[PDB]
């Protein structure tokens, strides 16, 4: 009987993740009823990255104002506390 606190939320995993982190993120987002996208689009609500901010982030922002850029630790800790934690705690911003 699985929790559903990612339901309705569209995720895109951008870039390369270490080891099996990509598989783990897929597992957790799916488990909590998140919808993972094969491609970026203005329907994506959360980009999960380990990489740093690059101009394509800003380009995606100008086309989707509510988009948020978050680190994989958000997903991990959401699993650990079994709750929807505020993604702002793990955000990616320009460097």
């Amino acid at each position: 009987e699985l929790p559903d606190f990612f339901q309705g939320k569209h995720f895109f995993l951008y870039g390369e993740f270490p080891g099996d982190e990509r598989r783990k993120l897929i597992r957790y987002v799916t488990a909590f009823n998140g919808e993972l996208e094969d491609y970026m689009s203005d329907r994506v609500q959360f980009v999960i990255t380990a990489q740093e901010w690059d101009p394509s982030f800003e380009e995606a922002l100008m086309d989707n104002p509510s988009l948020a850029f978050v680190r994989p630790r958000w997903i991990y800790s959401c699993n650990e506390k079994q709750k929807l934690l505020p993604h702002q705690l793990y955000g990616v911003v320009p460097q």
Partner: protein, 77 residues
């Protein structure tokens, strides 16, 4: 831990024609399952539905997936 590692190491092709496909897939993947994509279908450890093609895999059932997750381990087909 709520998400137990049950289907670790198993590669299952889940055809989209399967009833209750989305929930079945969600729970299977949530408990460490590994879905195989269509073109990579012939090389998979289990098949859900029928042994055609890839009879080298092992046939199981959605009932099998649910029974595995409720017994909290792997089990007979």
């Amino acid at each position: 831990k709520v998400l137990l590692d049950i289907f670790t190491g198993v590669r299952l092709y889940l055809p989209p024609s399967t009833p209750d496909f989305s929930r079945l897939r969600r729970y299977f993947v949530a408990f460490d399952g590994d879905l195989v994509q269509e073109f990579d279908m012939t090389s998979a450890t289990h098949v859900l539905g029928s042994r055609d093609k890839n009879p080298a895999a092992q046939q199981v059932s959605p009932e099998w997936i649910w029974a595995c997750i409720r017994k909290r381990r792997l089990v007979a087909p």
